[PDB]
Amino acid sequence: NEKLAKKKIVSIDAGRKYFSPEQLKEIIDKAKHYGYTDLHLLVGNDGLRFMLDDMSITANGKTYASDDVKRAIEKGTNDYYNDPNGNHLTESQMTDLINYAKDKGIGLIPTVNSPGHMDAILNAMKELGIQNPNFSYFGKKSARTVDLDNEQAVAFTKALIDKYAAYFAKKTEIFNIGLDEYANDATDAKGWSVLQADKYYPNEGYPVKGYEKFIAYANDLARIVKSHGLKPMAFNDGIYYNSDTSFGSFDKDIIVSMWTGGWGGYDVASSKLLAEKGHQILNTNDAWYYVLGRNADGQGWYNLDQGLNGIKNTPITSVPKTEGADIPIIGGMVAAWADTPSARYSPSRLFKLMRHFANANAEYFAADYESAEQALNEVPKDLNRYTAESVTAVKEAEKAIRSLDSNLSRAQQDTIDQAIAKLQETVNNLTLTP
Amino acid sequence: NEKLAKKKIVSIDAGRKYFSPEQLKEIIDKAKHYGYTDLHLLVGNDGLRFMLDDMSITANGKTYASDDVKRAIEKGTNDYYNDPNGNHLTESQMTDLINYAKDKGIGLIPTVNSPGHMDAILNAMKELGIQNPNFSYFGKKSARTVDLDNEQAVAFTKALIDKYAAYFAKKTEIFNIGLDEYANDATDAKGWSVLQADKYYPNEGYPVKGYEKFIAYANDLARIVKSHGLKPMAFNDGIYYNSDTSFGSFDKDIIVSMWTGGWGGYDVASSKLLAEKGHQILNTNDAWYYVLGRNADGQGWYNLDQGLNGIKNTPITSVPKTEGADIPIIGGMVAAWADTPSARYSPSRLFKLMRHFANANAEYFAADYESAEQALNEVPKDLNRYTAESVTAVKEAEKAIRSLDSNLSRAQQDTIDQAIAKLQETVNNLTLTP
Ligand SMILES: C[C@H]1N[C@@H]2[C@@H](O)[C@H](O)[C@@H](CO)O[C@@H]2S1
Numbered sequence: 046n047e048k049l050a051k052k053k054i055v056s057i058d059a060g061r062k063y064f065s066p067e068q069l070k071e072i073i074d075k076a077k078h079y080g081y082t083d084l085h086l087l088v089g090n091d092g093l094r095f096m097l098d099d100m101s102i103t104a105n106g107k108t109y110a111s112d113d114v115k116r117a118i119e120k121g122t123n124d125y126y127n128d129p130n131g132n133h134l135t136e137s138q139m140t141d142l143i144n145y146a147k148d149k150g151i152g153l154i155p156t157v158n159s160p161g162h163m164d165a166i167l168n169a170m171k172e173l174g175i176q177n178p179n180f181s182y183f184g185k186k187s188a189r190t191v192d193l194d195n196e197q198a199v200a201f202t203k204a205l206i207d208k209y210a211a212y213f214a215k216k217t218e219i220f221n222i223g224l225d226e227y228a229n230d231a232t233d234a235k236g237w238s239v240l241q242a243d244k245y246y247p248n249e250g251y252p253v254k255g256y257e258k259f260i261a262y263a264n265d266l267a268r269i270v271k272s273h274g275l276k277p278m279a280f281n282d283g284i285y286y287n288s289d290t291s292f293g294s295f296d297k298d299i300i301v302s303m304w305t306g307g308w309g310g311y312d313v314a315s316s317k318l319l320a321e322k323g324h325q326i327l328n329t330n331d332a333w334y335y336v337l338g339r340n341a342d343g344q345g346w347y348n349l350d351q352g353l354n355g356i357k358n359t360p361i362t363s364v365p366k367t368e369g370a371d372i373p374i375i376g377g378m379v380a381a382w383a384d385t386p387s388a389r390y391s392p393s394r395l396f397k398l399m400r401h402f403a404n405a406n407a408e409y410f411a412a413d414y415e416s417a418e419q420a421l422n423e424v425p426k427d428l429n430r431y432t433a434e435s436v437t438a439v440k441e442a443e444k445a446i447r448s449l450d451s452n453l454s455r456a457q458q459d460t461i462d463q464a465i466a467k468l469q470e471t472v473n474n475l476t477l478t479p
Numbered sequence: 480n481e482k483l484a485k486k487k488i489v490s491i492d493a494g495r496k497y498f499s500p501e502q503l504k505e506i507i508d509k510a511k512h513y514g515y516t517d518l519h520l521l522v523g524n525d526g527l528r529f530m531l532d533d534m535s536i537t538a539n540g541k542t543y544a545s546d547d548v549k550r551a552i553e554k555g556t557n558d559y560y561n562d563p564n565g566n567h568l569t570e571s572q573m574t575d576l577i578n579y580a581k582d583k584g585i586g587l588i589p590t591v592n593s594p595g596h597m598d599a600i601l602n603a604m605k606e607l608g609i610q611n612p613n614f615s616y617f618g619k620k621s622a623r624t625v626d627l628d629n630e631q632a633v634a635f636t637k638a639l640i641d642k643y644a645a646y647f648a649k650k651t652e653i654f655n656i657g658l659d660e661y662a663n664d665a666t667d668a669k670g671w672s673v674l675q676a677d678k679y680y681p682n683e684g685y686p687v688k689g690y691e692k693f694i695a696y697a698n699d700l701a702r703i704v705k706s707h708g709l710k711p712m713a714f715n716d717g718i719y720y721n722s723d724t725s726f727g728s729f730d731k732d733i734i735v736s737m738w739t740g741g742w743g744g745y746d747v748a749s750s751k752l753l754a755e756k757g758h759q760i761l762n763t764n765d766a767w768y769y770v771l772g773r774n775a776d777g778q779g780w781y782n783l784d785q786g787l788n789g790i791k792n793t794p795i796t797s798v799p800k801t802e803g804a805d806i807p808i809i810g811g812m813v814a815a816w817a818d819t820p821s822a823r824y825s826p827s828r829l830f831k832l833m834r835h836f837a838n839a840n841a842e843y844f845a846a847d848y849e850s851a852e853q854a855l856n857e858v859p860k861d862l863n864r865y866t867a868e869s870v871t872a873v874k875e876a877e878k879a880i881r882s883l884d885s886n887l888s889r890a891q892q893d894t895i896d897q898a899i900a901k902l903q904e905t906v907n908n909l910t911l912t913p
């Protein structure tokens with residue numbers, strides 16, 4: 046019961062790269078087939094590729110008109126990557142997609158990323174006429190990150206998240222506000238250290254109250270998300286960066302998507318510390334990542350062979366940076382990313398990744414009852430014309446399928462498959478009365 | 480088309496007095512029958528008689544626990560009026576009620592009143608330990624009205640409205656924040672004048688920035704309601720009281736429920752001014768009111784005979800205080816109130832009020848197709864055994880009912896009724912083949 050109760054999630058970066066409703070439905074179908082519970086769909090992640098019917102934003106003592114906001118966002122996304130396959134999902138398409146998934150027992154968790162990975166929102170704010178929304182670091186301007194000192198940019202971003210959270214309310218359960226990799230371009234992947242620096246190295250030009258403002262921003266977004274009955278989620282790397290609790294406290298209702306244990310000079314809080322601070326954790330281990338188009342060994346970081354190795358060697362229970370502690374999880378999430386969004390999306394490769402993750406952690410993933418359900422639909426309804434002996438065999442075989450535990454794991458698939466094979470054999474053995 | 484497109488609403492004061500799900504369903508059934516579009520259900524109006532499953536409130540740097548909030552509210556409501564029939568509707572009952580109404584094409588519009596008519600919320604705040612939440616006027620303490628200078632009381636109230644608005648989001652369209660009759664007890668029905676007084680009569684002890692704070696409070700509640708995709712509505716009397724626009728501006732997205740033209744020394748803005756300021760208006764004329772238990776002439780203000788006279792003499796298009804202007808309306812609302820909540824609720828009297836309002840404005844109210852639908856269900860399906868002539872008559876008569884305009888008004892009911900009578904006659908005249 047405890048293993049199957051976990052969430053098993055596939056993540057798709059539909060922020061950087063367009064995915065059609067048709068493609069996303071296929072992913073949902075495989076998710077259901079392999080025993081997953083949720084699709085985690087990034088729609089704001091560098092690009093912004095989801096448009097509400099009403100995009101009007103009220104911030105800064107005014108309202109930015111819906112059609113201007115839409116034009117600004119479409120243009121801003123194209124400035125990031127003008128995808129020949131499409132620009133954005135519409136509200137009708139998203140509503141239908143979420144419905145389609147819900148009918149299959151699959152949840153959807155959106156991401157609209159900020160204050161990093163928000164290239165298109167920054168572009169859009171500039172198109173609307175908001176001044177200098179981007180963060181800069183000693184004359185290097187970030188293309189991806191808002192400046193938390195810019196009240197008008199921050200107000201516009203919060204109102205945009207409020208608008209999206211209102212749409213997702215009641216049809217979803219978790220909203221991922223992101224928070225990963227602050228100003229990774231402008232600071233050469235040292236953004237958290239930069240935000241914390243002035244406290245410890247004053248009078249050197251580091252951003253004043255940088256990290257303090259970041260905590261308040263994270264907490265303000267968590268408040269917005271909670272106000273719509275949704276659980277806020279965020280990536281781990283900026284949450285108590287350098288294990289430093291002295292700047293303030295993150296909202297404990299933020300679920301942590303634990304994706305990285307950090308690296309040389311990128312010293313993240315342990316999952317131990319985060320659990321201790323009262324955060325639930327979704328294991329989003331980068332061991333399992335696939336960046337689209339990096340399709341074999343040698344083709345770069347998070348190539349498909351690397352991801353498949355990570356899946357084979359790092360079980361769903363193995364969370365980044367535990368400090369040897371036993372870290373409880375709400376589930377595991379395998380992620381496909383579109384860092385090079387002009388890469389060809391290969392459904393077979395994504396499905397291979399998804400299948401391997403399910404197979405490697407088979408006790409966690411739901412079994413497939415689809416074919417048992419269909420076999421039951423295909424049984425002849427009326428058996429009177431057949432011999433009593435042969436009829437009994439079919440009725441007992443149907444009864445046996447219907448009696449199967451409805452909570453079997455993928456590890457126990459053969460129990461279901463044997464029961465189907467038995468029914469089919471009895472049906473084949475029906476003998477007409479002489 | 481324009482008349483039938485209007486909202487036709489019955490209002491029920493289930494704040495002061497308990498109404499069961501069963502009773503409210505009967506009211507919905509009559510509403511549908513008479514051609515109404517909506518039930519306007521006050522649930523916070525002196526008493527507070529609707530409890531969410533999670534009532535935890537975060538305000539004032541803390542959280543008031545759900546069970547403590549529930550206990551505080553139940554007790555606070557009982558302190559206002561301990562109704563032997565019941566205390567509150569639960570979340571499950573409300574969800575079911577709204578569903579029941581939606582299946583009948585009837586919307587539900589809740590009211591949770593503040594900053595007046597909030598006796599039970601004030602009591603509840605005191606039970607939780609919030610200090611001095613009530614407004615006072617020269618040593619007379621209001622039992623019904625929060626003090627807008629009390630930041631902790633105001634913060635708790637706003638968070639309570641946010642919690643209710645979140646529940647009603649997506650299953651309703653309008654949320655009535657009330658705003659009527661500020662401190663009517665403590666000021667002898669002069670509360671708006673008291674809030675405005677200090678601006679014009681300084682150094683006399685009147686509440687400093689009273690009305691300015693009221694505008695900001697109204698606007699803050701409207702912002703909260705809009706954030707959940709709902710349209711905020713409020714009663715007219717405190718909106719530009721004394722036609723004074725100099726204190727600030729009310730949110731134009733507040734629909735005005737225009738209920739009173741005012742009276743001696745109670746000088747409200749005209750509906751002309753409110754329409755000019757950009758507010759849509761729901762005609763809630765007090766001409767049509769019935770206070771439960773005031774059942775005949777001589778039994779007090781808003782007695783049933785008075786209400787029935789008001790219905791006969793004041794059409795749905797006649798809005799209070801027009802200044803002779805032509806005032807557009809979104810619809811009309813007939814209201815039953817429970818000022819003396821120990822009064823016996825008489826469904827027949829409420830239905831008489833509802834019926835008279837529909838009959839007096841018959842071109843506005845939808846016709847009843849229920850009996851036509853049932854007559855069609857009762858037609859014999861198989862007619863082969865009957866003579867060709869008699870069969871043709873039935874088929875033509877069925878076709879005629881099915882061809883009726885689906886947007887007839889109550890004024891045109893006889894067209895539907897004649898078509899039913901014709902079908903029934905043809906069915907009676909079916910003649911078996913010899
Ligand atoms: C939390 C996420 N942040 C980064 C994401 O933007 C990249 O696409 C991914 C693959 O390069 O790596 C990390 S995971």
Ligand SMILES: C[C@H]1N[C@@H]2[C@@H](O)[C@H](O)[C@@H](CO)O[C@@H]2S1
Nearest residue numbers: 659714738770781816817818
């Ligand atoms: C807006 C509403 N405020 C008052 C309401 O509290 C009373 O029950 C009703 C009947 O006495 O009269 C007015 S209507």
Ligand SMILES: [Mg+2]
Nearest residue numbers: 097098099708
């Ligand atoms: Mg809309």
Ligand SMILES: [Mg+2]
Nearest residue numbers: 124125168188
């Ligand atoms: Mg650019």
Ligand SMILES: [Mg+2]
Nearest residue numbers: 214273648707
């Ligand atoms: Mg909401």
Ligand SMILES: [Mg+2]
Nearest residue numbers: 274531532533
């Ligand atoms: Mg709940």
Ligand SMILES: [Mg+2]
Nearest residue numbers: 558559602622
């Ligand atoms: Mg009392």
Ligand SMILES: [Mg+2]
Nearest residue numbers: 269272703706
């Ligand atoms: Mg809000």
